Paper text:
In the first step of the HP, GFAT synthesizes d-glucosamine-6-phosphate (GlcN6P) from l-glutamine (l-Gln) and Frc6P, releasing l-glutamate (l-Glu). GFAT contains two domains: the glutaminase domain responsible for releasing ammonia in the hydrolysis of l-Gln to l-Glu and the isomerase/transferase domain, which catalyzes both the isomerization of Frc6P to d-glucose-6-phosphate (Glc6P) as well as the transfer of ammonia to Glc6P to produce GlcN6P. The active sites of the two domains are linked by an ammonia channel, which forms when GFAT engages with both of its substrates, l-Gln and Frc6P. The main distinctive feature between prokaryotic and eukaryotic GFAT is the feedback inhibition by the HP product UDP-GlcNAc, which inhibits the glutaminase function.
As a negative control we generated a GFAT-1 variant that prevents UDP-GlcNAc binding by mutating Gly461, which is located at the bottom of the UDP-GlcNAc-binding pocket. Kinetic measurements showed that GFAT-1 G461E has similar kinetic properties like wild type GFAT-1 for l-Glu and d-GlcN6P synthesis. GFAT-1 G461E did not respond to UDP-GlcNAc treatment, as expected from the crystal structure.
Numbering used by the authors:
A (entry chain B): 2 to 227, 244 to 293, 308 to 681
B (entry chain A): 2 to 227, 243 to 294, 301 to 681
């Protein structure tokens, strides 16, 4: 889901400049939800913009944002030339996880057939059914099945029973949130409060951008309780940008005000009051010269790996320092167990580093899927160190596992790629993988950056063990050489594309690996599932003989991973078993693995690295393969079907 | 792959009776798989059996045992009526490793063209290359491409180079095994030791059955190192011995067996059984196994039998352990260790395949009732990572066979680090049941089918019973324990209720008959049900079935759902019900039309879902047993519809080395 609104106060914008700003704001947020979209602006065709704020127009349509961009245009009733000196427009892209992604279920919702109050909502109201029966008995009719409509039909109920003729828009919103349960990030608009916007949040992101050629009256808005507002000093020119993400606002200004839970922001008379510089460059959210975000993010891994280690890894003296842990590493080493909790590819990053964490810490290491971790009420203890891997820092199950472990007194550590996220804030300490914004739905650099981050932690946990000095040096030299080796893998892009032309027509593919490459075959199978829609499955190589090997014949595509580590011989037995079953597999192996290369037709030869880093090099070909397969099948790699990025609700 | 030898000592048997006994023995060993079989016995047609001892006859053939039985009676020079007061016959089914299947590569392997020594072998001699070069340099010509022939040629080399004319058959074999490297189970026969047998093993099962109408000298054979120290009938000579690599070949003649251990050399000399080794001893123990337990009966396949007899195998697993009169649990196998176990700080379950799924299926209740960390590891990955293990860990090893290599090596790994080891096995005398500090035999009866059906559900019940032991002193858990135990009391009848829906499963099998993939989705107690169901359909049906954790759909796998991909969802009445419904709304929202396995009374889902398999409600931590059975049957029926032999093992090892 995504939220974006544009409030231009005494900065004249025509109706086309606003609609093109609402759509352009949703395009920056489309990667969070692309099942439907909508916009809410002022209607009417009066040359005097003042006589139009009493008419709200809603243009909602099913599909991505490009389906709404064309629905907004070529309309016969909306004159796009009216100049508005003061105007508020709200927009929203929706991730329809339930029901149909129809225009009636898309946002902004409405409170009646005349649009007196329209709201855009990100989250879930855990008591909308009770609010739907109370509002229906008073005389309100419902049109949609979404839980957002109960917020629109309720802000009007507080307006129809107010005590004074001029109850501020904040008071109406404050009474609403008091009746809403669960999480929500809202942005209201009403004809009765022209140009006024109200932004409240609870368990969901919501910031407010500001731009103005004049000086701002302060840089610390004081929270109020039922010399106070943020506004231009001498003049009135100001532009606000409500949004649930920082990408929809960086293009216009890098000055935002990250709200907090229960903070009811409100723009009145062009002044921002709360009741109760961004460190990002636009180039980071631009595809550049690549045709897709995913392809850029795969080919930027040489850089993102370097950024993850910047200011943390010194190769002249072989020292590792994660500043985020400087005030806890001592207490972390007196703990007795590591628990890694995450979902999806973040969980695979844990599987990919579990062995080296066990090796260098000598502690038990338990890697848990967040959803199952919660279902079982897993035992947690005060001397447990619990890591929570989340590219977004907002994943529902991972965040709930965090609060679960905090309640039991465990030491909590956040491995995130989003500063200010829930997981990064609520953990005792934090490590920011610093991989840059990830716009593609599939995690590519986030995986390898989480990988490297956990290896760097492992290197801190053994920096006082004489017997492990050489092992640490081996690994750090591998990290020094890792960016260049990633480039070597990317230079085989064309070779991967050719092998993809031999598989795009297949329905299934088994990816097999063990040891350090169990995670590789799991993550590779998830990528091929997510963007290619082929039935790809990861199979632990050691488990073939126990049943799954029966599925292999000359028709079943197979990809195997055979690297030069301590499992090489065992991986050769699995390969011999596959061949005996008439399998003709593609083997990802080391360049110097002459034996494997001679006896196998299709081989992807990757350069050798340290055994505990090879997983980074062996997964990249499967990222590229998934990409090429998706292209061959006519799919879009930046907008896979049936889901979006970051699972923040239930 | 299968060994069987029958030694009748002063128990008269005709040649026909001996050969019928050997053939019958191999028939109990076919269920594993094989490519060739053979027998070795005394030739010659002299009416006096004493003179026929210097003529060993061999009949080996590539094919099934039935073809061998036809070749036995199809011998024009052989008289089947000669009566032998003393005779040793050996038989073998082969699973070719070194050398292609053929008569020459079949066992018994001989030491020369006159059959002075013959040997049947299960396993692989790793150093068969070096040994072959040595014996060839001494003047021994080989005729087969098997590693086994080196054993036959080597024992003759020891005989030819013996120091005294009366060196014992044992001493020769001792010198042979001292040069062998690898795994083996061996039975020797020779004209120079008429009527004598020598059996030895290293890393491969070998047992000895005994029968006599006369009292035996002992039930504990003492080991002899290099009249009161061997096993024999006391007042008379008559006795029968049965060497075998699987008790299934012995149980119809006797239930008194001796399980040999690595490097034991058991010898029968003058009808007396001794056990040599370069007060320790081997016990004569009684097996509770019955011939009926390894027969199909009225069922058309072992897979069908073992699925439909699960009401009975569940009861056997609980027999003598769960008291439904005062609701108590007692696992006698743990009596001398339960106190140390409760002072430990972590449970680790280590297994492969379906045994591993049994750990996943009971992890939550073990966590709930023990309140200890519970870690469930795949044995192969457990070894690759060198997982940290400590002296206060309790490590469980789940293995129907008790011989799985990675699980066994995980056991030895954990023993080296001082952990308390517990075996959950279905095979008396197996490696894991022995080497563990204690065990809990699951008592499900033998599993003859290729896939694990009753073994899974009996392991499931066994770990629940252990969980109930670990909390029998907690006041706050008395209610929960009673609930679980009333569920176990009602479980056999609920399994029958599920088996009565077999017709509903067949209908689903015809709907998936033509399908290439199917996603099986579940969470919580039914995560394991997904993994186990998907493995069964992979193993038995050969279609791409995959178990997906329902909570992980939104993180990528949901992209496979459309109007074409078959989906099976498991939704039960437990604390994860609302979350399972949400996963169902996500699947449907993406044009998915899934089959839902749910509770009988879940009226909401039954109306909103077209096809639903409606299983009866049980305790939440027991539902996995009921909801997996429809998936067992589904795999079975799909296979039948597609013309597959469900009792045929398609999983073959690496190719045969031809050299
Ligand atoms: O390709 C991976 C997907 O993007 C998805 O599997 C993702 O990894 C999880 O949803 C966890 O995301 P977070 O790291 O933000 O928690
Ligand atoms: O369908 C299950 C198969 O029979 C297989 O998965 C089995 O579970 C193990 O591979 C063998 O291990 P154990 O003999 O130790 O159980
Ligand atoms: N390795 C021996 C015996 C194999 C077996 O049957 O266990 C052979 O190939 O003949």
């Amino acid at each position: 889901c995504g939220i974006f609104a544009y409030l231009n106060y005494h900065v004249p914008r025509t109706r086309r400049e606003i609609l093109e700003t609402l759509i352009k704001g949703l395009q920056r947020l489309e990667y969070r939800g692309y099942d439907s979209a909508g916009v809410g602006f002022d209607g009417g065709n009066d040359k005097d913009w003042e006589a139009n704020a009493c008419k709200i127009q809603l243009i909602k349509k099913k599909g991505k944002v490009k389906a709404l961009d064309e629905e907004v245009h070529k309309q016969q009733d909306m004159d796009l030339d009216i100049e508005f000196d003061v105007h508020l427009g709200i927009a929203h892209t929706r991730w329809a996880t339930h029901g149909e992604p129809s225009p009636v279920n898309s946002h902004p919702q409405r409170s009646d057939k005349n649009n007196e109050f329209i709201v855009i909502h990100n989250g879930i109201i855990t008591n909308y059914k009770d609010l739907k029966k109370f509002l229906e008995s008073k005389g309100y009719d419902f049109e949609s099945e979404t839980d957002t409509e109960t917020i629109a039909k309720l802000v009007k109920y507080m307006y129809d029973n107010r005590e004074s003729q001029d109850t501020s828009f904040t008071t109406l919103v404050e009474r609403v949130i008091q009746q809403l349960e669960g999480a929500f990030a809202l942005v209201f608009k009403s004809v009765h409060f022209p140009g006024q916007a109200v932004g409240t949040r609870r368990g969901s992101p919501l910031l407010i951008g500001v731009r103005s050629e004049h000086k701002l009256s302060t840089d610390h808005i004081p929270i109020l309780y039922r010399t106070t507002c943020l506004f231009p000093v001498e003049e009135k020119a100001v532009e606000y940008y409500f949004a649930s993400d920082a990408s929809a606002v960086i293009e216009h200004t890098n000055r935002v005000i990250f709200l907090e839970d229960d903070d009811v922001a409100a723009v009145v008379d062009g002044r921002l009051s709360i009741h109760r510089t961004l460190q990002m460059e636009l180039q980071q959210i631009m595809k550049g010269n690549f045709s897709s975000f995913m392809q850029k993010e795969i080919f930027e891994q040489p850089e993102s790996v370097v950024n993850t280690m910047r200011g943390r890894v010194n190769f002249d003296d072989y020292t590792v320092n994660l500043g985020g842990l400087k005030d806890h590493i001592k207490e972390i080493q007196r703990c007795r167990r590591l628990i890694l909790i995450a979902c999806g590819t973040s969980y695979h990053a844990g599987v990919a580093t579990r062995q080296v964490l066990e090796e260098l810490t000598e502690l038990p290491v338990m890697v848990e899927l967040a959803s199952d971790f919660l279902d079982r009420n897993t035992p947690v203890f005060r001397d447990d160190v619990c890591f929570f891997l989340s590219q977004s820092g907002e994943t529902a199950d991972t965040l709930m596992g965090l609060r679960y472990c905090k309640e039991r007194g465990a030491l909590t550590v956040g491995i995130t790629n989003t500063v200010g996220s829930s997981i990064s804030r609520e953990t005792d300490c934090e490590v920011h993988i610093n991989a840059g914004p990830e716009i593609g739905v599939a995690s590519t650099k986030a995986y390898t950056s989480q990988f490297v981050s956990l290896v760097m932690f492992a290197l801190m946990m053994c920096d006082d063990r004489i017997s492990m000095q050489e092992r640490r040096k081996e690994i750090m030299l591998g990290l020094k050489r890792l960016p260049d080796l990633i480039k070597e893998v990317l230079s085989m892009d064309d070779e991967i594309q050719k092998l993809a032309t031999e598989l795009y027509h297949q329905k299934s593919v088994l990816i097999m690996g063990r040891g350090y490459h169990y995670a590789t075959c799991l993550e590779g199978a998830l990528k091929i599932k997510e963007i290619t829609y082929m039935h790809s499955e990861g199979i632990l190589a050691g488990e073939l003989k126990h049943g799954p090997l029966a599925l292999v014949d000359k028709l079943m595509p197979v990809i195997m991973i055979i690297m030069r580590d301590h499992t090489y011989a065992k991986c050769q037995n699995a390969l011999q078993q596959v061949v005996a079953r008439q399998g003709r597999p593609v083997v990802i192996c080391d360049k110097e693995d002459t034996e494997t290369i001679k006896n196998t037709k299709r081989t992807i030869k990757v350069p050798h690295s340290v055994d505990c880093l090879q997983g980074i090099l062996s997964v990249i070909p499967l990222q590229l393969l998934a990409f090429h397969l998706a292209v061959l099948r006519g799919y879009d790699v930046d907008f896979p079907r049936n889901l979006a990025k970051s699972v923040t609700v239930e």
